[PDB]
């Protein structure tokens, strides 16, 4: 639970060896028919990041490269990206309030590589600043391809910011240069500032369930979900308010919004559970309440506040927006120069990732720069500087717009 570094994975890397080189192993995960893998999601790690007076950051045995009495202080975290070029737009949803970024380049595909800056194309509005140059061809074709290919990849670094950390030519099946890669991600990647004593909040992302058949009714049960901190550090056992929570159906007033808070026990931390919520990673929040409400799949997209919080939540929405004048990065000369990105039509489905929550976007009135919308469910107020409008243009989603709360 320390760093939310991102990664940009196109087709055919070999992904379990590189991610498990930087996350150790996979978590025990479950409850199939999950959510479609182009939606919002988060990563994790079963490792940590450290050193041993050593460029090498091994796995937690203390001798095997050599000694160095590892600092059992923190745990590394991560954000997932499977190895196909589809993984653009939900990652650019994730490329706003994460921590850093990996940058994946193969040599298996086209060597005048099309996809990487087709992938990395929000280096201005949101944050995209900490990367690495990472060659993934040591296997098939030797030093001629890599020889011209380092000139290829240094033909990327000029105004498109592709120079954050220089070339690492590897195949992660050998796990090579992970001493040098770990030295880069210790030293050459910093840790950005946070806030500590702020009142903590969370929007719920990835719910779970812990009452499989075969136990007693006297067990402690409740609602476990997933999340990651935007502010504060969340302790155990207080008035943890969720402000509308359930969709308040047939709500006739304003004070007919229900006061519902909870408590908390589990905050999963790979071996333990530090009861103050360690940010910079996936936090394993489990609520006290025993309903049909939260511990089902019913709850994704609600706030974590306290008694007497500030945001009042209704549907009155007006947004100021603009668009993108092509489909971002995609330009194929074999009959693909008309992937047209059309203006906001009335009553059209969208994806409005306000902050970091996927609710589908409905619209009601269209001007050239502002729009009055109404949304599919009651949705909290998070930020005005980004309202990440996405929209159907192909089989999966792509992001099209940037918004502003008015």
- Give the interface segment with other proteins, choosing from 6-14, 116-124, 192-200, 263-271 (CB under 8 A): 116-124
CA 376 to chain centre: 23
Residue ranges of the binding site for GTP: 12-17, 136-139, 171-173
Give the one residue of 62, 72, 155, 365 binding other proteins; rule: CB under 8 A: 155
CB atoms within 10 A of CB 335: 6
* Distance of closest approach, residue 149 Cβ to other proteins, in angstroms: 10
Q: Contact with other proteins (CB under 8 A): which of 11, 27, 35, 84?
A: 35
16, 46, 117, 381: which one contacts other proteins (CB under 8 A)?
A: 117
Indicate the pairing of strand 370-372 with strand 365-366. Answer: antiparallel
Q: Minimum CB separation from other proteins for residue 284, in Å?
A: 22
Question: How many C-beta neighbours within 10 Å does residue 404 have?
Answer: 16
Distance CA 80, CA 38 (A): 11
# of chain residues touching other proteins (CB under 8 A): 63
Backbone angles phi, psi at 341, to 5 degrees: -115, 100
Contact partners, residue 228, CB within 8 Å, separation at least 6 = 4, 42, 202, 205, 279, 280, 281, 282, 283
Coil, helix or strand at residue 6:
strand
Annotated binding site: 12-17, 136-139, 171-173
Site for other proteins in 170-229 (CB under 8 A): 171, 174, 176-177, 180
The rounded distance, in Å, linking the Cα atoms of 20 and 405 is 40
Residue of 11, 52, 97, 167 interacting with other proteins (CB under 8 A): 167
Phi then psi for residue 50, to 5 deg, are -165, -170
Stretch that binds other proteins, among 59-67, 92-100, 257-265, 325-333 (CB under 8 A): 325-333
* Calpha distance 146→169 (Å, rounded): 8
Give contact residues for other proteins (rule: CB under 8 A).
33, 35-36, 39, 112-114, 117-118, 121-125, 138-139, 142-143, 146, 150, 152, 155-156, 158-160, 166-169, 171, 174, 176-177, 180, 247, 249-250, 292, 297-298, 322, 324-326, 328-333, 337, 349, 351, 359-361, 368-369, 376-377, 392, 395
């Amino acid at each position: 639970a320390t760093i939310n570094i991102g990664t940009i994975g196109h087709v055919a890397h070999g992904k379990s060896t590189v991610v498990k080189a930087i996350s150790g192993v996979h978590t025990v995960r479950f409850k199939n028919e999950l959510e479609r893998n182009i939606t919002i999601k988060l990563g994790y790690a079963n490792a940590k990041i450290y050193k041993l007076d050593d460029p090498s950051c091994p796995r937690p045995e203390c001798y095997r490269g050599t000694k160095g009495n590892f600092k059992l202080v923190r745990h590394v975290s991560f954000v997932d990206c499977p190895g196909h070029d589809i993984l653009m737009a939900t990652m650019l949803n994730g490329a706003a309030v994460m921590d850093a970024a990996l940058l994946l380049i193969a040599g298996n595909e086209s060597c005048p590589q099309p996809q990487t800056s087709e992938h990395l194309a929000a280096i201005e509005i949101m944050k995209l600043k900490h990367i690495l140059i990472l060659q993934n061809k040591i296997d098939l074709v030797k030093e001629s391809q890599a020889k011209e290919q380092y000139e290829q990849i240094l033909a990327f670094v000029q105004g498109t910011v592709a120079e954050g950390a220089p070339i690492i030519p590897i195949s992660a099946q050998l796990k090579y240069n992970i001493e040098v890669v770990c030295e880069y991600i210790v030293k050459k990647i910093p840790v950005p500032p946070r806030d500590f004593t702020s009142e903590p909040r969370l929007i719920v992302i990835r719910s779970f369930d812990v009452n499989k058949p075969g136990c007693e009714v006297d067990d402690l049960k409740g609602g476990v979900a997933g999340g990651s901190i935007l502010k504060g550090v969340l302790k155990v056992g207080q008035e943890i308010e969720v402000r509308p929570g359930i969709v308040s159906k047939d709500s006739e007033g304003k004070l007919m919004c229900k006061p519902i808070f909870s408590k908390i026990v589990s905050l999963f931390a790979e071996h333990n559970d530090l009861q103050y919520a360690a940010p910079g990673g996936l936090i394993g929040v489990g609520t006290k309440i025993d309903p049909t409400l939260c511990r089902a799949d019913r709850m994704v997209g609600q706030v974590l506040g306290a008694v007497g919080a500030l945001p009042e939540i209704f549907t009155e929405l007006e947004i100021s927006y603009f668009l993108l004048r092509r489909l971002l990065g995609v330009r194929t000369e074999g009959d693909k120069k008309a992937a047209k990105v059309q203006k906001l039509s009335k009553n059209e489905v969208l994806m409005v990732n306000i902050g970091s929550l996927s609710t589908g976007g409905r619209v009601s009135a269209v001007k050239a720069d502002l729009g009055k919308i109404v949304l599919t469910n009651p949705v909290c107020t998070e930020v005005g500087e980004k309202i990440a409008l996405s929209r159907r243009v192909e089989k999966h989603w792509r992001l099209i717009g940037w918004g502003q709360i008015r």
